[PDB]
């Protein structure tokens, strides 16, 4: 699945900062029961930044195993060095994951030509479907619609997760690619708008704690019932905003613990524990969404 509500799943940890299997299983069961369409394993929200490649791969394989064919699993495979992106991608070749979510190189700020070569080379070393991931606020780099058009011509580059919050990109990209190229929002607060413009779903942080509502919202969207979808969206809007009151995934992990979905809200440095003021902010948004 590359449609509907796709969760950017947290990597729940024990107090030592290592993956908590019991909490992972609980989350995956919750997504299966909630109608979540797919899981992105070890992306931004899953702390790809603070896991090494072995630990990253371990979490993905554990997620795939625990999913047990019940829900598709997409691996986060981003790296800012092309050779490393290829190497990470190869760990999942012939694994059971359905596709990869691959971010524009961060920090080194490649040109649009460099982005084209990075993703082309990655695609050439895999049989897995590739979803491009654009998030300039984290990367320092902006994959423009014209380059997306170029890359969409590569056989196994099948979609884009667009996290700019710039809604004009939907139709600029759609104009330049074929009808089957998947357009996914990477920005919860604008994701319903993104779908109203022609987007096919959302890779969502909110879905971590509001999976049923999120799944319902995207289904309504896909059927053209936007007024009905907006009612849910307004119920979820404080979460769409306040889950970033502190650096993601600090708030969403606390929210998961609060809802009893994970054993601990532990994260790896440089992410730090949620402040007291942060707890109260997220608690009120959970209450507004009617989740407590």
Instruction: Mark the segment that binds K ion (CB under 5 A) among 38-46, 87-95, 154-162, 185-193.
Output: 154-162
52 is an interface residue for its own copies by CB under 8 A: yes
Report CA dihedral (232, 238, 240, 241) to the nearest 10 degrees.
160
**Contact pick of 9, 88, 271, 285 for its own copies (by CB under 8 A):** 271
State how beta strands 182-185 and 157-162 pair: parallel
Burial class (CB in 10 A: 0-12, 13-18, 19+), 255: buried
269 is an interface residue for its own copies by CB under 8 A: yes
E-strand stretches of the chain: 4-8, 38-41, 73-76, 99-103, 130-134, 157-162, 182-185, 201-204
Distance CA 250, CA 248 (A): 5
Provide the minimum distance between the beta carbon of 276 and its own copies in the complex, in angstroms, as a whole number: 13
107 is an interface residue for its own copies by CB under 8 A: yes
Provide the minimum distance between the beta carbon of 102 and K ion in the complex, in angstroms, as a whole number: 14
Q: At residue 138, what are phi and psi to the nearest 5 degrees?
A: -100, -25
- Would you state the structure tokens that stand for residue 130, as one six-digit string? 């590739």
**Contact pick of 93, 117, 168, 277 for its own copies (by CB under 8 A):** 117
Q: What residues form DSSP beta bridges with 157?
A: 130
Provide the minimum distance between the beta carbon of 29 and its own copies in the complex, in angstroms, as a whole number: 28
For residue 180, the SS3 value is coil
Burial class (CB in 10 A: 0-12, 13-18, 19+), 12: buried
146 is an interface residue for its own copies by CB under 8 A: no
Provide the minimum distance between the beta carbon of 264 and K ion in the complex, in angstroms, as a whole number: 21
**Contact pick of 7, 115, 151, 191 for its own copies (by CB under 8 A):** 115
Peptide bond into 249 cis (omega under 30): yes
Provide the minimum distance between the beta carbon of 202 and K ion in the complex, in angstroms, as a whole number: 21
The closest alpha carbon to 169, from 205, 144, 142, 201, belongs to: 144
124 is an interface residue for its own copies by CB under 8 A: no
Please, which of residues 66-95 interact with its own copies by CB under 8 A? Answer: 80-84
Name the residue nearer to its own copies (CB basis): 134 or 139.
Answer: 139
285 is an interface residue for its own copies by CB under 8 A: no
Provide the minimum distance between the beta carbon of 269 and its own copies in the complex, in angstroms, as a whole number: 4
Q: How many CB atoms lie within 10 A of CB 142?
A: 17
Instruction: Mark the segment that binds its own copies (CB under 8 A) among 68-76, 117-125, 175-183, 206-214.
Output: 117-125
**Contact pick of 23, 36, 41, 44 for its own copies (by CB under 8 A):** 44
251 is an interface residue for its own copies by CB under 8 A: no
Provide the minimum distance between the beta carbon of 101 and its own copies in the complex, in angstroms, as a whole number: 14
Burial class (CB in 10 A: 0-12, 13-18, 19+), 244: middle
> Where does this chain bind K ion (CB under 5 A)?
157
> Where does this chain bind its own copies (CB under 8 A)?
44, 47, 49-52, 80-84, 105-111, 113-115, 117-118, 121, 137-140, 246-248, 268-272
């Amino acid at each position: 699945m590359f449609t509907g509500s796709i969760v950017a799943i947290v990597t729940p940890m024990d107090e030592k900062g290592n993956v908590c299997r019991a909490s992972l299983k609980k989350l995956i069961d919750y997504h299966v029961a909630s109608g979540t369409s797919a899981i992105v394993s070890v992306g931004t929200t899953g702390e790809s930044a603070t896991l090494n490649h072995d630990e990253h791969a371990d979490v993905v394989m554990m997620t795939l195993d625990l999913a047990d064919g019940r829900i598709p699993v997409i691996a986060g495979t981003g790296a800012n060095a092309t050779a490393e992106a290829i190497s990470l991608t190869q760990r999942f070749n012939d694994s059971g994951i359905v596709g990869c979510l691959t971010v524009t190189p961060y920090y080194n700020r490649p040109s649009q030509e460099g982005l084209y070569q990075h993703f082309k080379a990655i695609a050439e070393h895999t049989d897995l479907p590739q979803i491009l991931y654009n998030v300039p606020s984290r990367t320092g780099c902006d994959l423009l619609p014209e380059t997306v058009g170029r890359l969409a011509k590569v056989k196994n580059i099948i979609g884009i997760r667009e996290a700019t919050g710039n809604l004009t990109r939907v139709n600029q990209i759609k104009e330049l690619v074929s009808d089957d190229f998947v357009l996914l929002s990477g920005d919860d607060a604008s994701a319903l708008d993104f779908m109203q413009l022609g987007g096919h779903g959302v890779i969502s942080v909110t879905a971590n704690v509001a999976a049923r509502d999120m799944a319902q919202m995207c289904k309504l969207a896909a059927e053209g019932h936007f007024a009905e979808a907006r009612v849910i969206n307004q119920r979820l809007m404080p979460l769409h905003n306040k889950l970033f009151v502190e650096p993601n995934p600090i708030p969403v992990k606390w929210a998961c613990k609060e809802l009893g979905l994970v054993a601990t809200d532990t994260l790896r440095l440089p992410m730090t524990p949620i402040t007291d003021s942060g707890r109260e902010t997220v608690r009120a948004a959970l209450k507004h969404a009617g989740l407590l």
